[PDB]
Design a protein around this ligand. Structure first.
Ligand SMILES: [Cl-]
Ligand SMILES: [Cl-]
Ligand SMILES: [Zn+2]
Ligand SMILES: [Zn+2]
Lengths: 21, 23, 19, 20, 21, 21, 20, 26, 21, 20, 21, 19
């Protein structure tokens, strides 16, 4: 999930936005 | 080591600020 | 004030730890 | 709810209930 | 400034980025 | 109450997330 | 109104820093 | 060292929530 | 100790309670 | 109480050290 | 990254060691 | 500074130089 790919390496805050409702 | 747990606490705070509290 | 906003940042953290 | 855990202190149990 | 603007009311991510130096 | 201090504290964090150094 | 409870949360992090 | 300090930082916030009025260190 | 037990693997809410006062 | 003390006015890290 | 994460703790440490600016 | 204090930990004294 988010943890496996955003803990791996630092996600951009664009990548992160895609997880918002 | 509990690395994924630690990072996860940071991710909720980043999700909080990105998705904006009605999110 | 950002009272509610700050409070919520703590909540998400509490909810993470409990969930 | 923010409304209820920011006007007063929520317990672990109240927090567990905000999960599912 | 930053404290006033952002401790008065919520500053979004795009708004806080205007403070990057 | 130490309200400025506490909000300042969340700000520096949110600035780090958006600005890095 | 959970002011004491929020402050105390930063407090313990400040203490953790100081007491190494 | 760093990773130990970082972890401990999260422990105390966690203890703060779980320990309520009780506390966890004076 | 809490470090050896809770940093090497994830502690439950009950494991954490053991270190309260 | 550390709490009452440092949630009224900001405590220095040295005030904080005493409670270590 | 444990490092990017660490930086987050670094600013909180600098905020309270330094004061406010 | 992130590099320096995250490879090896910095004491409060060192941090005070970055004030
Ligand atoms: Cl961390
Ligand atoms: Cl706060
Ligand atoms: Zn806070
Ligand atoms: Zn952390």
């Amino acid at each position: 999930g988010i943890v496996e790919q955003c803990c791996t390496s630092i996600c951009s805050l664009y990548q992160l936005e895609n997880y918002c409702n | 080591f509990v690395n994924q747990h630690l990072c996860g606490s940071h991710l909720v705070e980043a999700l909080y600020l990105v998705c904006g509290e009605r999110g």
